[model samples]
Target: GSKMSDVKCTSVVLLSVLQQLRVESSSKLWAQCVQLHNDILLAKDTTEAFEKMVSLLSVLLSMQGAVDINKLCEEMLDNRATLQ
Candidate 1:
């Protein structure tokens, strides 16, 4: 997992650089990860959907807290479903 600072660096300074890095390093793996993320977004579940969604979301948040992770967590904790 990338550190919080690493993610910030990537977003603020190295986003274009990282895109080039991914192409240079492993294009296939990068594409696969994107596809998997899309799959997760589309999947449906009958039980524990919100919990599962939050769990997976926290994983993403830990990697990159650019989308106000604290507020997201606080709202989620308050059972606010429409955080967007």
Candidate 2:
């Protein structure tokens, strides 16, 4: 909960997600993750990056447990809430 916290949070989230494939690529999930990561560079603003995060999370949720994501997402919501 602080200035640019959510922005950086999502940035790092995508960064880490991208790295998930550095170990290996060619999976279906990695393709879309790379797209989102690539476009995050072109994202118009902090808000648009949040959209990227949501899309990124969409892919991530399928691979991981939803309960774990729910917890992580809620805290991210907290981060966004304080994005002011």
Candidate 3:
């Protein structure tokens, strides 16, 4: 379980990255990131919930700033399982 302070720290980091990418010329990608960010937020307390670590990397690597969501989700699941 995450303490309130822990979640606050996480939000600060996430928001920082989100703010940086907000000015990106493409509205579509920016919106997509925001949506994913929100989904991760809503799932924050769940064991199998989301994390932006891999998603952020995917965006960074994509030539057109597109993410293969299926792959990202699968990898995240695998990572969480490994961590346990």
Which predicted model would earn the best TM-score?
Answer: 2
lDDT of 3 by residue, 1-84 (tens): 353212332344434454554435345665555455455545644452645644544553452433344454555456456545
Evaluated at residue 64, the lDDT of candidate 1 is 41
Best by lDDT: 2
Which regions in candidate 3 have their CA more than 4 angstroms from the true location? Answer: 1-12, 18-26, 44-47, 51-53, 60-84
What overall lDDT goes with each candidate model?
0.38, 0.53, 0.47
List the candidate 1 regions with Cα displacement exceeding 4 Å. 1-21, 24-26, 46-84
lDDT of 2 by residue, 1-84 (tens): 344212333545444654543523556676675566555445656577578757756776555523333344455445456435
Per-residue lDDT of 16-39 in model 1, one digit per residue for the tens?
322433333345544433333333
Supply the global lDDT for candidate 2: 0.53
Candidate 2, residue 32: the lDDT equals 70
Error of 1 at 53 (Å): 8.5
TM-score of candidate 2 versus the correct structure, residues matched by position: 0.47
Score residue 73 of candidate 1 by CA lDDT.
36
Q: How would the candidate models be sorted by lDDT, starting from the highest?
A: 2, 3, 1
Among all windows of 10 consecutive residues in model 2, the one with the lowest summed lDDT is 1-10
Backbone clash tally for model 3?
Answer: 0
